[PDB]
Structures are given as structure tokens and as C-alpha cells.
Design a protein around this nucleic acid. Structure first.
Ligand SMILES: Nc1ncnc2c1ncn2[C@@H]1O[C@H](COP(=O)(O)OP(=O)(O)NP(=O)(O)O)[C@@H](O)[C@H]1O
Lengths: 68, 709, 148
RNA sequence: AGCACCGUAAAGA
């Protein structure tokens, strides 16, 4: 008798489908100003690829999605 | 004549070991291993296998003739691992494609370093082990690819398959082409002429070779007969080989007295608990109708049915949602639920692999399979039944040959589980003890070669400077096999020491055969432009050599008479279907003009080739050559290339599906070849045309993946 | 051009059954598939050797192609990649046969057997390729006392 | 073994 499969079959593919340091001078410190070069954090912007009344409705749903 | 020295070694009972070596090199036997073993095994190896390993250690080629199911594949793995130990490369020649996929899956599970080559796919060719068919290796040997200079070990499986007529040239030619500095293994079944084969390999490589032979077997068999309506199985031969025809005589008496059956036999088998069972019927409609008859019974629980549904769906989910809605799929799936299966070369290979796997598990007990399992799988069972002895091969409606009877009987017998196997044979005719004896206990049929010369061979050999056909013919097996039959009239002449035969057969002792056909092939090639005086190639030759999947002379003539240069994309696919397809059908079809016209020009070219062949007396016929090309699938292929549904296609013709799949795969191969030919001459429109046709064919299922891969 | 077949090269026209070609009188060696060949090496790239035939490009001998001393054939490793130079010096000569022709025009050539490979001291001549009859057995050993 | 072809005797309407 038997109830379960075998392994050699159950392997096939169609089936599966350091250290640290404490500086009292600089232990609990954090940067107060940070250098950025991105106009996004800086400023809000829409999604590049868009469309107006019909061309590539896929881009229209992308607009609806990413612009909120 | 070929001088050669054969010898025997003093070993123990269990096998026989014999060497064949050059006639002027004395014999110093093998030596024990040095250092670690290449591959330790969980169990203990028989004398058979350990002798094979000892041979493989000392780097000497070998021949191994022993019944299947005797762990004959161990020497292969040892050689593979030994090669992967010395950085060498190794090769494994399995003609079949599905068997090759299985062997690749196994070797990949084990070694992690393998590569598959085959007409359909290609995997990890930068692998120390190359599993593939043999024709690929033939093409390599021709074009001296980057492998022959790296691989040191070759291993052949199913050389006995060389006894055929249409492919026995490949293994021979491959051997003749290999270099003296190679080593390799032969893994055959029982054949009594092994000594001649070894002597041939030796005289052909000036290399020593070994031979192992044994009738040993782990699971002895018991043969029974069933006569029509006898309701009782009668023993004939027992495990010990004791053949008792008393029961055979009683069975014949029942036959004489006799003047919904296999159902009764399987019911008996199952009540005996003899499951599982294999059923070898030498046809297709018979298997299918027997399955239809036996659908009523059920040899499984319900949980097994759910699990079979699971695996079946997980397998055929790789297809579309429509190929699922296919009549074979549905009208078969219940048969699988119930534990009975069917397998023949008329199915979709997907279901074929599915059924083979399920059988490997045990989710189906009774399997109606004609000859596939006989050769290219390791999936033994507990008992086998021959629905009948008769069959069809080539032309003759011959009886069953002991060779094939044994090649199939080797299936029965599961090591460990089955203490023994039950063979049975159905009979409905007077069969006296002579035929029954020579069938059941008689020995296998010897290994005779075919070695029929071919165009491709001549041309691809004209390419080369160092190798000529006469060499091939003088080195073949069909020639080396005509030196032990020579002593006859030679012995008569030695007595005579009549004289006409003396002169002739002395000037014909070490000479060549089958030359006239060679000269006639050459004459044809000259008349048609595929060569010239001085026996040198011409452009047509370099266009035809690229073709191997069909008749290439006629393809090249179709080119150089301007046929494909005026047609469309698909029509070429159809005119090539006219070549790949080789089966007959009931009703010749009706074809439209646009698609028929070209076939008339095809037939005209064929008639021209036939006349040119008859002038040189190739013993050829015109009507056959012309009608050896069945266009019965031109419309099929046309509608398929128009982007249609397989279900809208399997209907147009009263032909099975697997035949269509073979047709179309061979067709795509031929299209690649023709693209390369057009690439050779210098044209581009034609190659774009053929490539577009290819892109049209491959859609859903004709080129699906192999579940074993 | 404009539904008109116009020649491109100086020579005699040849009409095979339906194919129209031209057979010029001076060209550079176009690559066939079985033709033997003699070649003077020009470069040694990490993977292969670059050879000079009278061809329109730089013929190529892959490191996988060159036969090894005797028949000691196992496989190609880095040690062979470094002997790639000490054995086949830049400027040497090889007598090979073509293996295949690429779509870019180049010719990959190999060494089927030991009769091929590298050449001794001998002497050499450079002529036009349209002055050797396409026939068999380019390798001759003449009774005069030499070979060609 | 099967499928097809041909003839043959018999029954009903
Ligand atoms: N000598 C042996 N003793 C015990 N089991 C064996 C032996 N040889 C093979 N087997 C078993 O046979 C299984 C597969 O058999 P199979 O692949 O059909 O053998 P084959 O000779 O390659 N044909 C292996 O997984 C082993 O468990």
C-alpha cells in the first residue's frame, strides 16, 4: 500500500509550481544637515510618462496610480 | 586479412571475460585500482560490474553484453566520474530523445556537471559530460568541433539498435571516425557474436578491447501460455530453465479442442495479486480498444485519484486553456484515474511522459504499450503479457523474434519487491514445440550490420582530403563480417591444392564490397552538378551537405530551378511536409491550385532525378521514389501556419496526433537547415522566408518542454 | 537594379541550372568549409590565435582547435592558456583546414589530425588564390626529393 | 490478426 508521493518525483519543476565601539564624544549624536542633490525630496513632481484622452490608456492608469 | 588475437581470462562463474587485441602484442592482464575510488556504491557490485570497473580503471575500452535490469549502467557512471576526476570530458550516446532526457536528469541529480544536446534543445554544452544522440556526434566528427579533442571516454547504449536498416550506418561511421587515442564503452544486450565486434573495434583502432557476457539476472522469470478460452494458464519453462512441454502439449490439445478475453486474463492477473502488469499489443487500435473495454474496472482508491488529478494538472498546466480542452486529454484522464494506462507512438508526448512517470510511481497497474517500453526506458514491472506473437516490421507480417521477445521480457521483474516475474503469451493457432521452443528458450538474434551507402555520406566525405569512402567501406562491419565466411570456398580451394574460384576469391579475399553502388552514386552526383571529374565538390555539394533531414539532392534542385523564389512563406513549409511525412492515410486529399501547382514541379524534378539514377543503374524504381513522398499533410501544415487551433487541425486528417508532431518537428529542423543553405549560396530573401515560416509554426504544443527536463 | 541584373566584377559569367554567378580573375581567399589552408600568425589573444591568410579579415584559430602534443587530450586549462605562446610563436606558420565561416566574414579553422599543425623550416611562396585548381590532395610528396 | 473488394445462400416487406 501507499498514500504519498515519492521524492525523486516531488523534485521536478512542474510540481513545485563584526564589532562596535562607544565614543562618549560622538555616541548619541546624529547629523544635523545632510547633502542632497535630488529635486524630488526638494520638490514634488508628477509622473513623467502621461497621456491625454486616448493615447496608450495603460499610461492613463499609470497616471491615476502614481500621481496620488 | 585482418590479423587479430583473442584470449580468455581465468575468472569465476557468474560471467565470461575475453579480450581482443592486436595480433602482435602479448597480454599483461589488468591491474588493481590506485587510490580512492571514483564512485563508492551503497551495495556490493557483482563480479560482472566489478570486472567492468577494473577494465575502466586501466583505461581500456569495453563491451558489455548482459540482460537489462542487471545494473548495466554502473560502468557508465564510473567512467563518467573518472573522466570528471582527470579534467577530461566524457560523452554518452543515447539515440532516443526521451531516454536521453531521463539519463540527463539522472546524471544532473548526481554529478551537477552535465550538458544535453538533442534535435530540440541544448543545455550546458560546456560540461565534462555530454548526453546526446549519435547523429549529433556524427556531424561533429565531420566538422571536427571543439569536442573530439577534449573527450576521452565515449559510452554507447543500445548498439543492438544498430541491427536496423535505416540507422545502422551512424554508429559504424562514428566508430570509424573516432581517433585511435580514444577509449569507450559499449552497453548492449545479449548478442552471441560479441567476439567479432571486439575484433572489429581492435583492427579498427589498433586498440585492445574487452568483452563481458553473462545470462545472469536478478529476478528470474516464469513463462506461461494462454490459449483462447482455456481459462487456465499453463506453465512451459520454470525459473531453473527446465522447459516442460508436457503442459505445452496439453495447451496445444486445448487449442485443437476449441475448434472479452484479455479482460478475463487481467481479471485473473489481479485476483492473483500479480500486479502491476504490462501489456504488449503490436498495434494501436487494439491497445486503445482494449482500454475502452476495460474502463469499467477500477484498481485504485479515491485519494490516489485526487493525487493523480493533482499531478496531471500540475503537468498539463504548462499548456494553454484550450489545448486542455482537447479530446485525448479528457477521454484519457479517467482511464488514468482508474489505474489503467495506454502508451504508443500516436499520442502527444506530454501525456506520454505523464504516464511513464505515473507508472514509475505505481498509480497505474495495467499498461497497454506496444514497443516503446521495450527499448528506451528503465521502468520494470512484475508481469508482462503478449496479446499475440504476430506483428509488422518493414514489409513482412513476420512472427515475433526471440530477440524482441526477450527485450520485452526483461521488463518484468522488480528487484527487491518481486521475488520473480510472470510472463504470459496468448496463442490462437497451432504452434508445434519447434517454433515455441526456438521462440521461448532460443537465443537472441546476432548483430548483423546494414551499412547502406548514402548521399550525405559521400558529399560530406568529399569535403575532406584525408578520408575517402573506400576507407569507410573497408573499415565497416559489413566488411569485417565477411572474413569468417571466406574460409569456405577458400577451404575448398585449399583442398583442390575450382581454379576459377581460386583466382577470383584470392583476388577478392581482403577486397571491398558494395563498390558498384558507390561508383553509381558518384556518376549521379556528376551528372547533376553535385561533384565533378577528379572527384571534387561543387557548390551544389556545399549546399546539400548542410541538409541531413531529408532527400537533399531534390531540395537543392528545387532551389537551383527557382521554386521557392516565387512562392510565399507557408507554401514552402507545405512542400517540405511533402518530404518529412512518410505515412499512408485512407483518403488522398483534395488540394487547391495555389498549393498544388508547386507539387507538380516537385514531381517533375523527382522524375528527372529518377531517370538520371536509372541511367547509372542504381537498381532504383521511379514510381516508388516519386510516391515515397506523401503530401497528405500539405493542407494541415498550411492551416497550422495560418495560426489556427490544434483541434481545428487534428480533424482534417484521419491520422493520429503524434505523427503530426513528428512531422512538424522534423519540418522545423529542415527549415533551419534550408535557412543555412540559403545563407551559404548568398541569398537572403529565401532565408528570411524560411525563418518566418519557423516563427509561424512554433505556437503552443508541437514544441513544448519535456517534463523530465 | 531596377529589375535588371547588373554585374559587379570583372570576369566570366556562369549560369548553373538557374543561378547566375561570376568568377573573377583576382580575389582574396573567401572561406570555404573543407578547404585546407596555410597561414602566418599575427597575434596571440588571451583566448585564441589570430592568423593571416589572403583573406579579407583576420582568420582565427581558437585555443580549443590546435591539437596537443601527441594525443594527450583531456581538456584545456589555464596552463594551456599560457603555453598558448611558448608553443606557437607570433610569426609562425600553420597548415590547417577550415572549420567554419562566420557571418562577419571571418574564418575559424582547426586541425583535424596530426598531419596538420605547425610547419618545419622549408620555404614559402605567396601567389594569387585564383591559380590553384579546386581539387583533392593538396598535400603532395613529389619524386624529385621534396614535398609541397 | 485485422480492414477493404467480389460472389454465394437464406428471411421479411
Ligand atoms: N547490483 C545491484 N544490486 C542492487 N540494486 C541494484 C543493482 N544494480 C542496480 N540496482 C538498482 O537498480 C536501480 C535502477 O535500475 P536500472 O536503472 O534499471 O538499472 P540499469 O542496469 O541501468 N537498466 C538503482 O536505483 C538500484 O537501486
Amino acid at each position: 500500500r501507499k498514500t504519498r508521493l515519492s521524492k525523486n518525483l516531488l523534485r521536478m519543476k512542474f510540481m513545485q509550481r563584526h564589532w562596535y565601539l562607544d565614543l562618549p564624544e560622538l555616541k548619541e549624536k546624529e547629523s544635523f544637515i545632510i547633502e542632497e542633490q535630488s529635486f524630488l525630496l526638494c520638490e514634488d513632481l508628477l509622473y513623467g510618462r502621461m497621456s491625454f484622452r486616448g493615447f496608450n490608456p495603460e499610461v492613463e492608469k499609470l497616471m491615476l496610480q502614481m500621481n496620488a | 586479412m585482418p590479423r587479430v588475437k583473442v584470449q580468455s581470462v581465468e575468472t569465476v562463474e557468474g560471467c565470461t571475460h575475453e579480450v581482443a587485441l592486436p595480433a602482435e602484442e602479448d597480454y599483461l592482464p589488468l591491474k588493481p585500482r590506485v587510490g580512492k575510488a571514483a564512485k563508492e556504491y551503497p551495495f556490493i557490485l557483482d563480479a560482472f560490474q566489478r570486472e567492468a570497473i577494473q577494465c575502466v580503471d586501466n583505461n581500456q575500452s569495453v563491451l558489455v553484453s548482459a540482460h537489462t535490469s542487471a545494473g548495466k549502467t554502473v560502468c557508465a557512471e564510473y567512467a563518467i566520474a573518472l573522466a570528471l576526476r582527470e579534467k577530461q570530458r566524457v560523452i554518452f550516446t543515447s539515440p532516443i530523445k526521451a531516454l536521453s532526457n531521463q539519463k540527463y536528469r539522472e546524471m544532473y541529480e548526481e554529478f551537477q556537471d552535465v550538458g544535453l544536446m538533442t534535435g530540440d534543445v541544448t543545455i550546458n554544452p560546456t560540461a565534462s559530460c555530454l548526453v546526446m544522440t549519435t547523429e549529433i556526434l556524427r556531424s561533429m566528427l565531420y566538422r571536427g568541433s571543439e569536442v573530439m579533442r577534449e573527450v576521452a571516454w565515449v559510452i554507447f547504449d543500445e548498439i543492438h539498435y544498430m541491427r536496423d536498416s535505416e540507422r545502422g550506418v551512424v554508429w559504424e561511421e562514428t566508430i570509424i571516425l573516432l581517433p585511435d587515442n580514444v577509449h569507450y564503452v559499449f552497453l548492449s544486450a545479449t548478442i552471441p557474436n560479441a567476439r567479432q565486434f571486439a575484433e572489429w573495434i581492435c583492427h579498427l583502432h589498433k586498440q585492445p578491447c574487452h568483452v563481458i557476457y553473462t545470462d545472469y539476472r536478478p529476478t528470474p522469470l516464469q513463462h506461461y501460455i494462454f490459449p483462447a478460452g482455456g481459462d487456465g494458464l499453463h506453465l512451459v519453462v520454470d525459473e531453473n530453465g527446465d522447459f516442460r512441454e508436457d503442459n505445452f502439449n496439453t495447451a496445444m490439445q486445448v487449442l485443437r479442442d476449441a475448434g472479452s478475453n484479455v479482460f478475463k486474463i487481467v481479471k485473473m492477473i489481479m485476483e492473483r495479486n500479480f500486479q502491476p502488469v504490462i501489456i504488449f499489443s503490436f498495434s494501436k487500435k487494439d491497445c486503445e480498444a482494449y482500454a475502452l473495454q476495460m474502463t469499467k474496472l477500477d484498481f485504485n482508491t479515491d485519494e490516489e485519484k485526487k493525487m493523480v488529478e493533482e499531478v496531471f494538472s500540475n503537468a498539463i498546466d504548462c499548456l494553454s486553456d484550450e489545448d486542455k480542452k482537447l479530446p485525448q486529454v479528457e477521454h484519457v484522464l479517467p482511464l488514468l484515474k482508474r489505474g489503467i494506462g495506454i502508451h504508443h507512438g500516436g499520442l502527444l508526448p506530454i501525456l506520454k511522459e505523464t504516464i511513464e512517470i505515473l507508472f514509475s510511481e505505481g498509480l497505474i497497474k495495467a499498461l497497454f504499450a506496444t514497443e516503446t517500453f521495450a527499448m528506451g526506458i528503465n521502468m520494470p514491472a512484475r508481469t508482462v503479457l503478449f496479446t499475440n506473437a504476430r506483428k509488422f516490421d518493414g514489409k513482412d507480417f513476420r512472427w515475433i523474434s526471440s530477440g524482441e521477445y526477450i527485450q520485452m521480457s526483461g521488463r518484468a521483474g522488480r528487484r527487491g519487491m518481486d521475488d520473480r516475474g510472470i510472463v504470459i503469451l496468448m496463442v490462437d493457432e497451432k504452434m508445434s514445440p519447434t517454433i515455441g521452443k526456438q521462440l521461448l528458450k532460443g537465443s537472441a538474434d546476432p548483430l548483423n550490420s546494414a551499412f547502406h551507402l548514402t548521399y550525405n555520406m559521400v558529399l560530406n566525405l568529399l569535403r575532406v582530403e584525408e578520408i575517402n569512402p573506400e576507407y569507410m567501406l573497408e573499415k565497416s562491419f559489413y566488411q569485417f563480417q565477411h572474413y569468417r565466411a571466406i574460409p569456405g570456398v577458400v577451404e575448398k580451394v585449399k583442398n583442390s591444392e575450382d581454379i576459377k574460384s581460386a583466382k577470383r576469391e584470392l583476388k577478392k579475399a581482403r577486397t571491398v564490397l558494395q563498390m558498384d553502388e558507390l561508383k553509381c552514386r558518384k556518376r549521379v552526383l556528376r551528372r547533376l552538378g553535385f561533384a565533378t571529374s577528379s572527384d571534387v565538390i561543387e557548390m551544389k555539394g556545399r549546399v546539400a551537405c548542410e541538409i541531413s533531414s531529408a532527400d537533399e539532392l531534390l531540395l537543392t534542385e528545387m532551389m537551383f530551378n527557382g521554386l521557392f523564389n516565387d512562392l510565399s512563406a507557408e507554401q514552402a513549409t507545405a512542400l517540405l511536409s511533402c518530404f518529412v511525412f512518410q505515412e499512408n492515410s485512407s483518403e488522398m486529399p483534395k488540394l487547391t491550385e495555389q498549393l498544388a501547382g508547386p507539387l507538380r514541379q516537385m514531381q517533375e524534378c523527382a522524375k528527372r532525378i529518377a531517370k538520371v539514377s536509372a541511367e547509372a543503374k542504381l537498381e532504383i524504381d521511379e514510381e516508388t521514389y516519386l510516391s515515397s513522398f506523401k503530401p497528405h499533410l500539405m493542407d494541415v501544415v498550411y492551416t497550422w501556419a495560418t495560426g489556427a487551433t490544434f483541434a481545428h487541425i487534428c480533424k482534417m486528417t484521419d491520422v493520429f496526433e503524434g505523427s503530426i508532431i513528428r512531422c512538424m518537428r522534423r519540418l522545423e529542423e529542415l527549415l533551419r537547415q534550408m535557412c543555412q543553405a540559403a545563407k551559404a549560396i548568398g541569398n537572403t530573401e529565401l532565408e528570411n522566408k524560411f525563418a518566418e515560416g519557423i516563427t509561424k509554426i512554433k505556437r503552443d504544443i508541437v514544441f513544448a518542454a519535456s517534463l523530465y527536463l | 537594379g531596377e529589375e535588371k541584373l547588373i554585374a559587379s566584377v570583372a570576369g566570366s559569367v556562369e549560369r548553373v541550372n538557374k543561378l547566375i554567378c561570376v568568377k573573377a580573375l583576382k580575389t582574396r581567399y573567401i572561406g570555404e568549409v573543407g578547404d585546407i589552408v596555410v597561414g602566418r600568425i599575427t597575434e596571440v589573444q588571451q583566448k585564441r590565435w589570430k592568423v593571416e591568410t589572403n583573406s579579407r579579415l583576420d582568420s582565427v584559430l581558437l585555443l580549443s582547435s590546435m591539437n596537443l602534443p601527441g594525443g594527450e587530450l583531456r581538456r584545456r586549462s589555464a596552463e594551456d592558456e599560457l603555453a598558448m605562446r611558448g608553443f606557437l610563436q607570433e610569426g609562425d606558420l600553420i597548415s590547417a583546414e577550415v572549420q567554419a565561416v562566420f557571418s562577419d566574414g571571418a574564418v575559424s579553422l582547426h586541425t583535424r589530425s596530426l598531419k596538420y599543425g605547425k610547419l618545419g623550416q622549408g620555404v614559402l611562396v605567396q601567389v594569387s588564390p585564383s591559380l590553384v585548381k579546386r581539387q583533392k590532395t593538396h598535400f603532395h610528396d613529389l619524386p624529385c626529393g621534396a614535398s609541397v
